[PDB]
Design a binder for this molecule. Sequence first.
Ligand SMILES: [Zn+2]
Ligand SMILES: [Zn+2]
Length: 230
Amino acid sequence: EYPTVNEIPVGEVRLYQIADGVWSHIATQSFDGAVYPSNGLIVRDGDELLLIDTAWGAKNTAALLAEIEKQIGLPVTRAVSTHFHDDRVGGVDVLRAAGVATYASPSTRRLAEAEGNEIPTHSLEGLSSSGDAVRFGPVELFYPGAAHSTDNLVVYVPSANVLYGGCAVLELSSTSAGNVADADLAEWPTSVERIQKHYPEAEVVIPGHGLPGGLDLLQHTANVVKAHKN
Ligand SMILES: [Zn+2]
Ligand SMILES: [Zn+2]
């Protein structure tokens, strides 16, 4: 069913249909001597597509665009990066050069610049406080508070009851919170609680890495982060 690392080589991207006009994109990348799968989202908006997150690299992101053209046949016109790390902004330059308007919060843009990563072109205002929510094309963007990073955004597709958590949400098989160098472990469970409270009708929850599931990914994440912190 849902692709895993073993089934996607680095440089290749698969799409997985979640709902009508909602797909995840799955790519693999080598980081610090380990290969990991990574998810982002694609949402139909009329005869155009909104992309959430790059495919983690310029080559992967070019492969992503090529795979979208083959499988869906509609142009990607806008993209949003959900935090400042390279699984999320790496490839923005490819998108921009391809004519895609790239967006992120001012905080993500600042952090990306400070870290030497690619920087989305446009700022998304109205997301500076925990609980803030803004409409963007066919999705709602939500800032739940600091979790995996201080700037992390989550994305809800109202038409499909699909919640894309990015790296603020962990898959059910996870036993740890993973890379926590930029994380706020004290706040993270509270940030997840905000998501739970704001999107109780969510039917599918997609983590930044790994298998989609139901609403239980949220509580599981809070539990793992709490147990991580000890
Ligand atoms: Zn990250
Ligand atoms: Zn990540």
